[PDB]
């Protein structure tokens, strides 16, 4: 598990697939971008309970959610679709697994689009995110 401080400061989440940072747009679209200065990739992780986080786009003021068909969007209000198990994998990247749809992961495709929940799974490059400083 992670200590305090992981949650104190905002983060960028760097995806192994394509080198995309996870981006939360003002209108609730979620996607990836390679540019580290994009203002919409500054995220805030918040511990909801042990090993569970919500992920907020700071500038968008919206929380990452995974929907029942597997799509990603970001909502103004926190709901049960906004919670993820955060786990450090053996390769030192993290995964984010839906607490509601427990086989599905937050993931980005090589195109920059999100990858639909049902196509995700362990061992994919698409599900691996490295948190780092937002500075």
Author numbering: 20 to 154
From the publication, what sentences describe this entry?
Canonical FGFs including FGF2 act as a paracrine and/or an autocrine by forming ternary complexes with FGF receptors (FGFRs) and heparan sulfate proteoglycans (HSPGs) on the cell surface. The FGFR-FGF-HSPG complex induces the dimerization of FGFR, resulting in a series of intracellular signaling cascades including the activation of MAPK/ERK pathway, PI3K/AKT pathway, and PLCγ pathway, etc. Through these signaling pathways, FGF2 regulates diverse cellular responses and has beneficial effects on wound healing, wrinkle reduction, and protection against neomycin-induced hair cell loss. While the therapeutic potentials of FGF2 are widely recognized, a significant challenge hindering its broader application is inherent instability.
